[PDB]
Amino acid sequence: EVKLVESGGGLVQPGGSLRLSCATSGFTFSDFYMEWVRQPPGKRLEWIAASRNKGNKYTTEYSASVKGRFIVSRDTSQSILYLQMNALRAEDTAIYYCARNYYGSTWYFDVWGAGTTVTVSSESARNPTIYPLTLPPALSSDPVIIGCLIHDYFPSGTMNVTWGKSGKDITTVNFPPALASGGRYTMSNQLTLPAVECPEGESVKCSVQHDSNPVQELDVNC
């Protein structure tokens, strides 16, 4: 029941600021070293800030890469770990993770967050536009193939796609985003399932969850 859930992240203009937060539950927050880790697009984990247990003054430490612009705090009453991000630049774009630096015999990170994406960009948000991916009953071989073309959106950040169908035969394929022409992304998500699990005038809804924004869903006909 040791859970860490971070939030607040997305599009931010260079010079902008953000306040990422880490909601820590199922343990005595007030006495575990908390840690902030980031992961740039095609790079290693990178350690940034560090908070300390109410054992030796909630002292901090910051990576050189961030010493000065980021500032780490903790709302002890509410068990939340904060990260104040000042004067962001594009190099700051990465998935942010909050971790618990446990110490028993040794030190190691026992529990990690899910992460939260932060895109520091000059560009501007554009929600995907969901188009159904269907075959006129002259191309469907059974199993049926269906999908969702998630198109022309910004930023890329994080896109979780789920369908209103699951079980034995039912496959989901989510292709990574592709930078098109406009410098905007496109992605596709196909669902394959038993032809009898996708008769007619039925449909399956696909759900798009992008960064920190509300859900977007389309109804796709078998």
Binding site: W47, T106, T129, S188, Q190
Partner: protein
């Protein structure tokens, strides 16, 4: 700073195999007082947060299969996977939990080798809903092939090909260690509406004959 050097940076095993990744530090990680090294091994599966793998240099975290084992002390550590399996597909990071700033290594991508598999191809015509916007996107999906190297040609109508095509490889499947790819050719409603026989043909080591899913229509 303390540097974490991990090698190889890539590993391609056939599975059922036994492997060993290494990880040396520029500085002793071992306590000179409690005598334990402060080095952890993390496993990072495709689009998932890291997960505790090994603590101390050899303590396997509760839940981790007995296939994962770790040795060393001082500055040169190892990690061996006794019998590589299809879900082992991930990145292995070793970290210095010795002193600040904490550091990680480049990691090691573990890739699974398998017997060549043939791609299933699909062609989806542009949506009505989308047409009525200027655009037209003909998407072709290629699923479950091996190896990944697979060229796809988009001969619009007569014969063509172009810079109006997007391509995306899926990650290696954690069940079949097979790939999937989508190729999206997106033109204009007008543009689209000129020709009418749209084709997709992949050229995979598998078969000799370029595999060609196709479709003709546009008038309608």
């Amino acid at each position: 700073d303390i540097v974490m050097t991990q090698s190889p940076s890539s590993l391609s095993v056939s599975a059922g195999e036994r492997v060993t990744m290494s990880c040396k530090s520029s500085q002793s990680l071992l306590n000179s007082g409690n005598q334990k090294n402060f080095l952890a091994w993390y496993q990072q599966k495709p689009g998932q947060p890291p997960k505790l793998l090994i603590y101390g240099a050899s303590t396997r975290e509760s839940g981790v299969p007995d296939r994962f084992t770790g040795s060393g002390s001082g500055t040169d550590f190892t990690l061996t996977i006794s019998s590589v399996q299809a879900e082992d597909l991930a990145v292995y990071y070793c970290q210095n939990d010795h002193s600040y700033p904490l550091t990680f290594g480049a990691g090691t991508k573990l890739e699974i080798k398998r017997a060549d598999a043939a791609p299933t191809v699909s062609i989806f015509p542009p949506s009505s809903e989308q047409l009525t916007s200027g655009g037209a996107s003909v998407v072709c999906f290629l699923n479950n092939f091996y190896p990944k190297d697979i060229n796809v040609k988009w001969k619009i109508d007569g014969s063509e090909r172009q810079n109006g095509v997007l391509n995306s490889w899926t990650d290696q499947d954690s069940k079949d260690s097979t790939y999937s790819m989508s190729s999206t050719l997106t033109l204009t409603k007008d543009e689209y509406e000129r020709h009418n026989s749209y084709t997709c043909e992949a050229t995979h080591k598998t078969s000799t004959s370029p595999i060609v899913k196709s479709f003709n229509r546009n008038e309608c």
